[PDB]
Amino acid sequence: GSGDVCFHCNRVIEGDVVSALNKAWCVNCFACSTCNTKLTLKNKFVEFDMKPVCKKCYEKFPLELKKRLKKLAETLGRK
Ligand SMILES: [Zn+2]
Ligand SMILES: [Zn+2]
Description:
The chain is α+β, with helices and mostly antiparallel strands. It has helices at residues 55-60, 63-76; strands spanning 5-6, 11-12, 31-32, 37-38, 45-48, 51-54. It has one domain (1-79).
């Protein structure tokens, strides 16, 4: 309930602002782009290719690749 505009839909956050890619994302719009699983600050997820990825998908990548994809969310994720 901060009041940011979920860059995912460009509309005022209707729930919690999921800071992704340093932008504000709706918990309703932000969803594992690899599973369509609704993303929530309580659920486990990561940023990949500028898209959300559930921890299960982040695990579907080779151990040496996930550490590289996680490198994205580290700077292109929560701020
Ligand atoms: Zn939204
Ligand atoms: Zn997934």
